[PDB]
Structures are given as structure tokens and as C-alpha cells.
mmCIF file with all atom_site columns, C-alpha atoms in Angstrom:
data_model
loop_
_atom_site.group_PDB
_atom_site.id
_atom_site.type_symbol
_atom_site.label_atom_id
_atom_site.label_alt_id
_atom_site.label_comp_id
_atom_site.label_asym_id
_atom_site.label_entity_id
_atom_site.label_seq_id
_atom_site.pdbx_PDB_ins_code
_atom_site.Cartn_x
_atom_site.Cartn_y
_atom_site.Cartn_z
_atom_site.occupancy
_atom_site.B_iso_or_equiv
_atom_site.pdbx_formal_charge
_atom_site.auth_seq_id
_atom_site.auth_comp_id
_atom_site.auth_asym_id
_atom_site.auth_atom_id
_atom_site.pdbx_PDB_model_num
ATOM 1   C CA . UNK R 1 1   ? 0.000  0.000   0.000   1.00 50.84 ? 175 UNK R CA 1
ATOM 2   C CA . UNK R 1 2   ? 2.920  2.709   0.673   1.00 51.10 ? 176 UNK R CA 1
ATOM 3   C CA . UNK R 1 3   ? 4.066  4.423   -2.036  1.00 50.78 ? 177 UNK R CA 1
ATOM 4   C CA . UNK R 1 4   ? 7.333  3.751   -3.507  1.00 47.57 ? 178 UNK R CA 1
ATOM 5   C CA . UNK R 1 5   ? 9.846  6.659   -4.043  1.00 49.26 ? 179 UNK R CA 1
ATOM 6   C CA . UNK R 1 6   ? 9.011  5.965   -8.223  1.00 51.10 ? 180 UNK R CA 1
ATOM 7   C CA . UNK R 1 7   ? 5.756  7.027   -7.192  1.00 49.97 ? 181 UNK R CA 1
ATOM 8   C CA . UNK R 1 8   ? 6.712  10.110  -5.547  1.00 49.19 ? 182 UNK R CA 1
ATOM 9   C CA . UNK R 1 9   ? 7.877  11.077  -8.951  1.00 48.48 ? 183 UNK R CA 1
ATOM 10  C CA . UNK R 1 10  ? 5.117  10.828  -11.522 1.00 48.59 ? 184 UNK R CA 1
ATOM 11  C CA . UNK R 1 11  ? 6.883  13.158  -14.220 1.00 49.00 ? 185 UNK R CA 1
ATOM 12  C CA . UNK R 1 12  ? 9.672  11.515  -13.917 1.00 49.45 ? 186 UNK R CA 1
ATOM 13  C CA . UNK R 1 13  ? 8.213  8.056   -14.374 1.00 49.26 ? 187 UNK R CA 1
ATOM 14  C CA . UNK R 1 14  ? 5.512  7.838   -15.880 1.00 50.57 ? 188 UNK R CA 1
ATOM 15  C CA . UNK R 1 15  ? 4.944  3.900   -15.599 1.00 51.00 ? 189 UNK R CA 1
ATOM 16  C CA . UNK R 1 16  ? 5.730  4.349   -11.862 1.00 52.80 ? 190 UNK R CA 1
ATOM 17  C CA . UNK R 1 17  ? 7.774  1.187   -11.591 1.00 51.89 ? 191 UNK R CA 1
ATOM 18  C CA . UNK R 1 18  ? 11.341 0.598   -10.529 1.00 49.17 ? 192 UNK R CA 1
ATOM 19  C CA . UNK R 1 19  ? 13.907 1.582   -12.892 1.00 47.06 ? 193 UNK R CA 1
ATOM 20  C CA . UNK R 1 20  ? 17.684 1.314   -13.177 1.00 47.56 ? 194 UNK R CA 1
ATOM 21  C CA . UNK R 1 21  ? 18.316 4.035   -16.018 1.00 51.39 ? 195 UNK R CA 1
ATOM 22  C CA . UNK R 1 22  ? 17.134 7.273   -14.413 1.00 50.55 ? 196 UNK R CA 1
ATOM 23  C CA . UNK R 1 23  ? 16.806 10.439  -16.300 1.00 50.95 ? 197 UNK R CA 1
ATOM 24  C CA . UNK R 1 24  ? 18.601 12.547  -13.385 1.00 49.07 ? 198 UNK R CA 1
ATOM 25  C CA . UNK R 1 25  ? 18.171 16.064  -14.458 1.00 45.59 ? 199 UNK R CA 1
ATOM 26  C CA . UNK R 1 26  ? 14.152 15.371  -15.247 1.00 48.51 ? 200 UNK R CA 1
ATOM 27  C CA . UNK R 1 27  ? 14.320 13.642  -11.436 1.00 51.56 ? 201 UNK R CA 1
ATOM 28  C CA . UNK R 1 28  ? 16.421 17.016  -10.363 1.00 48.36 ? 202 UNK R CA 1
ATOM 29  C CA . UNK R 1 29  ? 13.866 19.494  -11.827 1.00 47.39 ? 203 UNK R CA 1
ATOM 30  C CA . UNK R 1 30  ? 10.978 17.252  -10.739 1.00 43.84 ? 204 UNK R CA 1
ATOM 31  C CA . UNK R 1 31  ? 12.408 17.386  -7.000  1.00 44.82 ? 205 UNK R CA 1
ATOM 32  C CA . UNK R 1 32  ? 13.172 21.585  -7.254  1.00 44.82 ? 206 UNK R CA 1
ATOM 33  C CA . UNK R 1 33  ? 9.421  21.490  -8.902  1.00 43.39 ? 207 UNK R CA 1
ATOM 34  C CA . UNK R 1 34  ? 7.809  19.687  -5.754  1.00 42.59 ? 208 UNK R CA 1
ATOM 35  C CA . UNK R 1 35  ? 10.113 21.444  -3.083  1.00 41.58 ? 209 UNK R CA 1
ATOM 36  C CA . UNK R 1 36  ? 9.030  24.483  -4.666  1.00 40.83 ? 210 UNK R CA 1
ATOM 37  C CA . UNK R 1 37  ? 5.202  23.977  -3.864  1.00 35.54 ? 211 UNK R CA 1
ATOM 38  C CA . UNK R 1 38  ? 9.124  20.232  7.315   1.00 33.30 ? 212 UNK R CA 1
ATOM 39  C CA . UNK R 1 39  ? 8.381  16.480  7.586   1.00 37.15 ? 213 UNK R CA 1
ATOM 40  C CA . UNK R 1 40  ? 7.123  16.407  3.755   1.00 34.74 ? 214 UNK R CA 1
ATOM 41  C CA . UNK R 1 41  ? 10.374 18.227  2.880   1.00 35.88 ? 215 UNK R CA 1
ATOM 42  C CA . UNK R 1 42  ? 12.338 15.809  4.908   1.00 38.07 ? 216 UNK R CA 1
ATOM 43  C CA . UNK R 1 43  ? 10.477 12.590  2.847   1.00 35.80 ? 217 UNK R CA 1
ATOM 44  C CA . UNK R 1 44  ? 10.674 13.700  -0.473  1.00 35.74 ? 218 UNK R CA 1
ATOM 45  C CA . UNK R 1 45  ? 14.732 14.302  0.615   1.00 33.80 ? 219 UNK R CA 1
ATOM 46  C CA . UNK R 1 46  ? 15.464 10.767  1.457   1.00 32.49 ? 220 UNK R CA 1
ATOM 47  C CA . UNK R 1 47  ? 13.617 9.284   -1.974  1.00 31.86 ? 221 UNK R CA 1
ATOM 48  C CA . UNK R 1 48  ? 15.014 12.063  -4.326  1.00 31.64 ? 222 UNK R CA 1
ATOM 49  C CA . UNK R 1 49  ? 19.044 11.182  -2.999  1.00 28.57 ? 223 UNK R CA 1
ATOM 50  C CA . UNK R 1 50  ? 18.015 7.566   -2.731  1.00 26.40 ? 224 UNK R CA 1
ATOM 51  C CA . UNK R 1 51  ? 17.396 7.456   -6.306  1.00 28.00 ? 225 UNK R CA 1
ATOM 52  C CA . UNK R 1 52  ? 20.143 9.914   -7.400  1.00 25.80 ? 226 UNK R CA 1
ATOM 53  C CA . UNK R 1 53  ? 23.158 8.215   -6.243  1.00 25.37 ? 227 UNK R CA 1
ATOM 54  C CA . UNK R 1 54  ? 23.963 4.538   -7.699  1.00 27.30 ? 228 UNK R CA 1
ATOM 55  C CA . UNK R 1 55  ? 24.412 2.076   -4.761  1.00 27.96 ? 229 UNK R CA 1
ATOM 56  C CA . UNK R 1 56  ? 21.605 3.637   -2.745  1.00 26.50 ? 230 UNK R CA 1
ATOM 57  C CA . UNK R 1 57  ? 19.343 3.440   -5.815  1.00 24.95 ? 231 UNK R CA 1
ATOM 58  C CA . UNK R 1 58  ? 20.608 -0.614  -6.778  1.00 24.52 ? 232 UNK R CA 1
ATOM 59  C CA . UNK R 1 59  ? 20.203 -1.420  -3.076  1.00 21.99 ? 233 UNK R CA 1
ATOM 60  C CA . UNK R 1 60  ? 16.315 0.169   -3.170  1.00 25.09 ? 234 UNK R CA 1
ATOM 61  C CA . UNK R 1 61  ? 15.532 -1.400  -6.486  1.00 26.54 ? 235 UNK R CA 1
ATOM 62  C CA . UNK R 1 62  ? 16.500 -5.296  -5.074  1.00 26.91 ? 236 UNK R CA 1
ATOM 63  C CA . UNK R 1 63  ? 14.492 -4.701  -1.970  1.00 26.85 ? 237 UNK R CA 1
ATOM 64  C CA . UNK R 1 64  ? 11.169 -3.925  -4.098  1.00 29.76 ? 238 UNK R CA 1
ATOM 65  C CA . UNK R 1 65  ? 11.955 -6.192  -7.127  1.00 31.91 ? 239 UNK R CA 1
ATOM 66  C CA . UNK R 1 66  ? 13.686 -9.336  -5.424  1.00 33.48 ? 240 UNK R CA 1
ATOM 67  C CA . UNK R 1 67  ? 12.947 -8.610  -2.009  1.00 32.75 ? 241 UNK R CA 1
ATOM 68  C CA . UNK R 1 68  ? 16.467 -8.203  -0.489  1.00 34.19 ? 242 UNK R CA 1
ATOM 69  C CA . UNK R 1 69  ? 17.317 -5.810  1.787   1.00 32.10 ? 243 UNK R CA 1
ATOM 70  C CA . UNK R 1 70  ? 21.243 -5.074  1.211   1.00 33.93 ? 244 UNK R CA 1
ATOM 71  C CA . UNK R 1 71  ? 21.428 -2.217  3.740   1.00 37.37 ? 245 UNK R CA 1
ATOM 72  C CA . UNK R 1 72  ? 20.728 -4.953  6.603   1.00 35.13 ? 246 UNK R CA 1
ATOM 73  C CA . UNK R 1 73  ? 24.023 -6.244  8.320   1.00 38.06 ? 247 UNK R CA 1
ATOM 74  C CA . UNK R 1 74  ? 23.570 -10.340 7.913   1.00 39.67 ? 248 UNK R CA 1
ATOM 75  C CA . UNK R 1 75  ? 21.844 -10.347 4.471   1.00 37.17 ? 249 UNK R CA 1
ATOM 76  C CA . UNK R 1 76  ? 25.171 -8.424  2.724   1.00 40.21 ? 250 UNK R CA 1
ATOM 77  C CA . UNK R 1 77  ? 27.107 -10.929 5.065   1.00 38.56 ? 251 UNK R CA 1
ATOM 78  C CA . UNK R 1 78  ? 25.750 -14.011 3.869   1.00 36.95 ? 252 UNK R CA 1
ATOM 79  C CA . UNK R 1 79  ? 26.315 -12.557 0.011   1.00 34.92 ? 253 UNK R CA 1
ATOM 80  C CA . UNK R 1 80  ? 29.773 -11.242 0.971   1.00 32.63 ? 254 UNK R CA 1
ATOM 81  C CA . UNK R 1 81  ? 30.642 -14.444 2.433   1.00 31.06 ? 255 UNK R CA 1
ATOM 82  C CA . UNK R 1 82  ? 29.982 -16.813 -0.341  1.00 30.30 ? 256 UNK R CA 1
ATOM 83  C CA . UNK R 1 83  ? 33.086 -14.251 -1.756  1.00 27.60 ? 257 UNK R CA 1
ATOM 84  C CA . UNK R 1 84  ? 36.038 -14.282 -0.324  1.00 29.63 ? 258 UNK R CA 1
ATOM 85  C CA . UNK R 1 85  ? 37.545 -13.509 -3.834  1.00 30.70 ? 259 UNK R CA 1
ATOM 86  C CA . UNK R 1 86  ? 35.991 -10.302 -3.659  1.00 30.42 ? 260 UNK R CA 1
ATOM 87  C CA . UNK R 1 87  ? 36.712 -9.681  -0.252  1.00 31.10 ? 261 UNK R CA 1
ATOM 88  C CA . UNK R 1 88  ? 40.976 -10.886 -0.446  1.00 32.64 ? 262 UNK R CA 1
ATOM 89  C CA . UNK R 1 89  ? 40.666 -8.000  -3.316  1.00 30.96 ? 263 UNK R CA 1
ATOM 90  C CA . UNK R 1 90  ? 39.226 -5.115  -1.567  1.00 31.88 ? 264 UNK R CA 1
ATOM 91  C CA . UNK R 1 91  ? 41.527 -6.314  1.684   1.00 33.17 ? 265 UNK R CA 1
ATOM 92  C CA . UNK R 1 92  ? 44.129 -5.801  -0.960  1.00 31.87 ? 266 UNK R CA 1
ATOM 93  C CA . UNK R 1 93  ? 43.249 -2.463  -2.000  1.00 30.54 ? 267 UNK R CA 1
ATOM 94  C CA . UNK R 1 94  ? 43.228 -1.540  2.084   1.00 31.76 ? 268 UNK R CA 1
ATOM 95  C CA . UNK R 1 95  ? 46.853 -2.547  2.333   1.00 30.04 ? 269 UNK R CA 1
ATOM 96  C CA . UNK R 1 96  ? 48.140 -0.985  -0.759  1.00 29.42 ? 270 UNK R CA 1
ATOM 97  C CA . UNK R 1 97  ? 46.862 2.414   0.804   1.00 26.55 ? 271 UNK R CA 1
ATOM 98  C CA . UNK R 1 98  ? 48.480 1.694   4.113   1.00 25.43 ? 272 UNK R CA 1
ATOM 99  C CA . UNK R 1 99  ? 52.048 1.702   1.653   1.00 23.54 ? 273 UNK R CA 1
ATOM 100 C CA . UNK R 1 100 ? 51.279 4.459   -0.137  1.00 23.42 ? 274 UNK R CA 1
ATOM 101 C CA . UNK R 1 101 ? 53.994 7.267   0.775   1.00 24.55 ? 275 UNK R CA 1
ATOM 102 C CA . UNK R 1 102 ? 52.641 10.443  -1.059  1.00 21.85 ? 276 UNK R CA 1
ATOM 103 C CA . UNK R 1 103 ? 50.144 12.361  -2.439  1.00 22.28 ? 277 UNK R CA 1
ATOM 104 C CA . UNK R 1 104 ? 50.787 11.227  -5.778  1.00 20.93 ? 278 UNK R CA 1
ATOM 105 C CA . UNK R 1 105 ? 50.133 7.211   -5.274  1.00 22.12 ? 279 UNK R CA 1
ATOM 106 C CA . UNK R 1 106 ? 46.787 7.796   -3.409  1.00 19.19 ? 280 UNK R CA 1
ATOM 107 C CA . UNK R 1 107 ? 45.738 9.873   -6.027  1.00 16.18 ? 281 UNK R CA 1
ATOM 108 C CA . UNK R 1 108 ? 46.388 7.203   -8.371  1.00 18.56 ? 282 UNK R CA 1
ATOM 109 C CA . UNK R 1 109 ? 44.810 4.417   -6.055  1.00 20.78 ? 283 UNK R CA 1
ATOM 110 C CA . UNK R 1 110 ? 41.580 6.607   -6.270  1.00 20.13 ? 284 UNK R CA 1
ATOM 111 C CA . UNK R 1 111 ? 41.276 7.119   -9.651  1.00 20.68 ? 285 UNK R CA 1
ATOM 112 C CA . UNK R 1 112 ? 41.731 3.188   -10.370 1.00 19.97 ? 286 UNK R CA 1
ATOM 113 C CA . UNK R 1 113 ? 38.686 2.766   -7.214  1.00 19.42 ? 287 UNK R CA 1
ATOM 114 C CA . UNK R 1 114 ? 36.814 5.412   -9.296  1.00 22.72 ? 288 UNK R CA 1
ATOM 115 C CA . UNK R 1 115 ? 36.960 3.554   -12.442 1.00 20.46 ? 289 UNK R CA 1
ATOM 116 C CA . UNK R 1 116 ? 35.907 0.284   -10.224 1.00 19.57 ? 290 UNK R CA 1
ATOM 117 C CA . UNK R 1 117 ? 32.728 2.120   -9.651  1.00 20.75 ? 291 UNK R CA 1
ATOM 118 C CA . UNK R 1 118 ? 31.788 3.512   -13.276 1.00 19.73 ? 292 UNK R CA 1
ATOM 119 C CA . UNK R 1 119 ? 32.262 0.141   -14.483 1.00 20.51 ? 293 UNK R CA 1
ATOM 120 C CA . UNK R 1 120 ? 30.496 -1.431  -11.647 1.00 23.25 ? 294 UNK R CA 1
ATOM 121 C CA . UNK R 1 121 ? 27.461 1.153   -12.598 1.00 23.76 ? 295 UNK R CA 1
ATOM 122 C CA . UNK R 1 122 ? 27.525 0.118   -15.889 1.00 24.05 ? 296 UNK R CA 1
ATOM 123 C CA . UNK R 1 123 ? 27.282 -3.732  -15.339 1.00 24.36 ? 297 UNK R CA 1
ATOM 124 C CA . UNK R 1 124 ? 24.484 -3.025  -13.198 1.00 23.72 ? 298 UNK R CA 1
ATOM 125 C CA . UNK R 1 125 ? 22.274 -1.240  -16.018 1.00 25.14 ? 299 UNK R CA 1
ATOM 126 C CA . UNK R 1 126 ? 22.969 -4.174  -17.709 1.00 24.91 ? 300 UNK R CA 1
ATOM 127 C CA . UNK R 1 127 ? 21.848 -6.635  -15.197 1.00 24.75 ? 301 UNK R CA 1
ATOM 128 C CA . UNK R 1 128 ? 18.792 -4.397  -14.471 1.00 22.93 ? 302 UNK R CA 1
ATOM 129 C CA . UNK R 1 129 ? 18.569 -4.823  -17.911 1.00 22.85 ? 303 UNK R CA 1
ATOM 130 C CA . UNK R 1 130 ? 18.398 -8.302  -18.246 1.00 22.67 ? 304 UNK R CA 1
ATOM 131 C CA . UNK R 1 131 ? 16.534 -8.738  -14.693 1.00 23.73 ? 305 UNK R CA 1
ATOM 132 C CA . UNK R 1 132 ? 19.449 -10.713 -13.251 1.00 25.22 ? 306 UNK R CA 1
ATOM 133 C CA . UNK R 1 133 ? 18.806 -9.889  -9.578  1.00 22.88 ? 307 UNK R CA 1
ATOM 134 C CA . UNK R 1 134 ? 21.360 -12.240 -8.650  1.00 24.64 ? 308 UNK R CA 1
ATOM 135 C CA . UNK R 1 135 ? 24.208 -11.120 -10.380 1.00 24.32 ? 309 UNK R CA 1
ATOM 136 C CA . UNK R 1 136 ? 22.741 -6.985  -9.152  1.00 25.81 ? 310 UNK R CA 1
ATOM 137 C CA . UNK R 1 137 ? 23.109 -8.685  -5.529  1.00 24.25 ? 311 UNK R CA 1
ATOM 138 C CA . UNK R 1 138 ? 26.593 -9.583  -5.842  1.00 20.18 ? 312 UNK R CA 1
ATOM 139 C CA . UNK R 1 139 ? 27.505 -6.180  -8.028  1.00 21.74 ? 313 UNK R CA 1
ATOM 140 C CA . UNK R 1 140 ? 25.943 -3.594  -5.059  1.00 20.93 ? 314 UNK R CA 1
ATOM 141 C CA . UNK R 1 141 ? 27.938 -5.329  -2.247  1.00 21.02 ? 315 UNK R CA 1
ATOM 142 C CA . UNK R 1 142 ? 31.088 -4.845  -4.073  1.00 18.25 ? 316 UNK R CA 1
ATOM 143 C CA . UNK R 1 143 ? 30.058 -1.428  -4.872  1.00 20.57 ? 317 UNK R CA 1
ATOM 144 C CA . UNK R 1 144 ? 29.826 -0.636  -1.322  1.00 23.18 ? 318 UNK R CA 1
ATOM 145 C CA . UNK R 1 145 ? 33.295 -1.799  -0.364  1.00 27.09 ? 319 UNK R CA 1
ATOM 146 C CA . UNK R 1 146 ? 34.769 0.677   -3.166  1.00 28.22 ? 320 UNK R CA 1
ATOM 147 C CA . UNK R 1 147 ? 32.536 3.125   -2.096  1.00 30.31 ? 321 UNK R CA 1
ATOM 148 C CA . UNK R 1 148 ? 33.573 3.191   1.522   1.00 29.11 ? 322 UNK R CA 1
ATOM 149 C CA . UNK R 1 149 ? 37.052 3.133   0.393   1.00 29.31 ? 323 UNK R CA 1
ATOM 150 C CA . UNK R 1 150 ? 36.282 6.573   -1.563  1.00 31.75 ? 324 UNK R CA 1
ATOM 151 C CA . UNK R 1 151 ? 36.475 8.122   1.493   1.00 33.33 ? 325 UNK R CA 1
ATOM 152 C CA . UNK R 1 152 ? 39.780 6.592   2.652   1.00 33.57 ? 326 UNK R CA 1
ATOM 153 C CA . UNK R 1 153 ? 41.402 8.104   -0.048  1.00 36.21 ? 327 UNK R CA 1
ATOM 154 C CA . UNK R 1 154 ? 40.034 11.412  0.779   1.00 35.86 ? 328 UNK R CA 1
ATOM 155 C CA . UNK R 1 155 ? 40.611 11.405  4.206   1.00 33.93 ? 329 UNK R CA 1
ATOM 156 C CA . UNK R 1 156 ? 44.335 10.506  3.767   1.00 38.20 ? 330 UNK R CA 1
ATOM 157 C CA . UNK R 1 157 ? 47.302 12.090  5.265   1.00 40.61 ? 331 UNK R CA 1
ATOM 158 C CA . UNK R 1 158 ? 51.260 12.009  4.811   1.00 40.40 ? 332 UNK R CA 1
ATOM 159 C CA . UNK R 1 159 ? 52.465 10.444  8.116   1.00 41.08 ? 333 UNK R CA 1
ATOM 160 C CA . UNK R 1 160 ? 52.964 8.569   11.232  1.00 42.30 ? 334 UNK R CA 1
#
């Protein structure tokens, strides 16, 4: 019965049913358009950024379409788990930070991580696609981990 945050979007989509490919600047005018007409504010906030960025938006599509919620601790733990490929590489990626000894190398490091994510965004418009939930599962947990290393490379400093 409650409203999905597709629905709180009508212009935007029109069929009002979970999609992948969003049209972000028709989503971005849409949002200014309905802001523009506290609480209400504060629930149109959440859907609009839910939608706008990637992993927030994959994790919110497999909880309506395939009924997995990613954002809860044990159900990315059993999918991360089955992994430990995946997890030995991001580990990996940790460690080679921890090495780096200037500027210059975590700049590099984060460029690589930000190509991880582009092409992790555009394997999942294909599996959204295709409707391979499965494969979308195992894509948005990895996209968290490089994610959450964004920030590691931003927060970095030169020193002991």
C-alpha cells in the first residue's frame, strides 16, 4: 500500500515502476518542482538522494523487485561471504593504501577505485537490464566496499 519513491515522482516516471536508467536532471527538476510547492520536505529528501546516487538506488531497487534488503548487516554478510575472492581483493586495495607514501600514489589508487565504480554502474544497467537480480546482488555489495574506500582516499594524510 505505501508508495514507492518511483511514485513520488510521476513526471519523472511515468509507468511508476522501478527503474535502473534514471533520467537525473528530469528527477532534479521534478524534485526543485515539488520542493518548490518540514516532515514532507524531509520525505521527499530521502527518496530524491536515494534514487540519485547509484548504490543507494541498486540497493532500493532489489528490496522492491527481489525482495532483499542489502542495507541490513547479515543479508550483505551471507552474500559477501559466499566471496572471499571479492573480499581478499578489496583487503588488498586496504593494504596498498596503508604503503602508499605520497600524495601522488593515493591519487592514483583513487582514480583506479573510481573507475571500479563507473564500471560497476555500468554492469548493473545491464543486469537491471536483463533482470538478473542475482548477479545486481553480488555487483551492489562490491560497490559498497569501493565506495567506503572513496572516502579513505580522501581522508588521507602524509604520516605517522
Amino acid at each position: 500500500f505505501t508508495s514507492t519513491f518511483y511514485e513520488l515522482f510521476p513526471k519523472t516516471f511515468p509507468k511508476k515502476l522501478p527503474i535502473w536508467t534514471i533520467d537525473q536532471s528530469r528527477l532534479r527538476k521534478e524534485y526543485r518542482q515539488l520542493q518548490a510547492q518540514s516532515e514532507q520536505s524531509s520525505t521527499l529528501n530521502q527518496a530524491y538522494h536515494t534514487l540519485k546516487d547509484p548504490l543507494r538506488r541498486s540497493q532500493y531497487m532489489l528490496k522492491l523487485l527481489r525482495n532483499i534488503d542489502l542495507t541490513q548487516e547479515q543479508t550483505s554478510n551471507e552474500v559477501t561471504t559466499s566471496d572471499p575472492q571479492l573480499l581478499l581483493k578489496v583487503l588488498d586495495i586496504h593494504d596498498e593504501l596503508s604503503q602508499m607514501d605520497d600524495e601522488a600514489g593515493v591519487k592514483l589508487l583513487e582514480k583506479q577505485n573510481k573507475e571500479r565504480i563507473q564500471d560497476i554502474e555500468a554492469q548493473l544497467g545491464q543486469c537491471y537490464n536483463d533482470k538478473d537480480y542475482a548477479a545486481a546482488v553480488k555487483l551492489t555489495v562490491e560497490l559498497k566496499y569501493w565506495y567506503n574506500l572513496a572516502k579513505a582516499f580522501k581522508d588521507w594524510a602524509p604520516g605517522k
